[PDB]
């Protein structure tokens, strides 16, 4: 009984961990997008006057 | 992503530089015209009295 219940508990823990990893995948994605935005903002073609970087 | 955005930025810089060079081409042209005008003005056939050089 203890071993079967421990199997159940281990599966529950796997579900929890999968939830957290799925949460962090979108963190990766939006971090990539933010880096792209910064690399684009970094160039001097963009003007602070006409609100290029504020967008 | 950074390399592609850097390619984009480099193309933007090329566009800017082309704008400036196109601006200076007409500077060259009108400077040539001004030199021609001065070389013509420099001769003593022209009279200050009857407004030859003032034109």
A52 touches chain B (CB under 8 A): no
Nearest Cβ partner for A45 among B2, B6, B16: B16
Write phi, then psi, for A52 (nearest 5 degrees).
-75, -45
Residue B5, C-beta contacts closer than 8 angstroms, at least 6 positions apart = A36, A39, A40
| CA angle (A38, B15, B28) in 5-degree steps | 145
Please name the method used to determine this structure. Answer: cryo-EM
The phi and psi torsions of B33 (rounded to 5 degrees) equal -60, -40
A19 to chain B nearest CA, in Å? 28
Whether residues A36 and B9 touch (CB distance < 8 A) is answered with no
Judged by CB atoms closer than 8 Å, whether chains meet at B12 and A45 is answered as yes
Which one, of B1, B3, B10, B8, lies nearest residue A35 by Cα?
A: B1
A45 touches chain B (CB under 8 A): yes
Distance CA B9, CA B49 (A): 59
Residue A51, min C-alpha distance to chain B (Å): 18
Q: Taking a C-beta distance cutoff of 8 angstroms, is the pair B1, A35 a contact?
A: yes
Closest CA to B13 of A41, A43, A40: A43
């Amino acid at each position: 009984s203890g071993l079967n219940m421990a199997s159940k508990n281990s599966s529950d823990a796997i579900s929890l961990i999968q939830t957290a990893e799925g949460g962090l995948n979108e963190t990766h994605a939006i971090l990539q997008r933010m880096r792209e935005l910064a690399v684009q903002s970094r160039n001097d073609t963009n003007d602070e006057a006409t609100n290029d970087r504020s967008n």
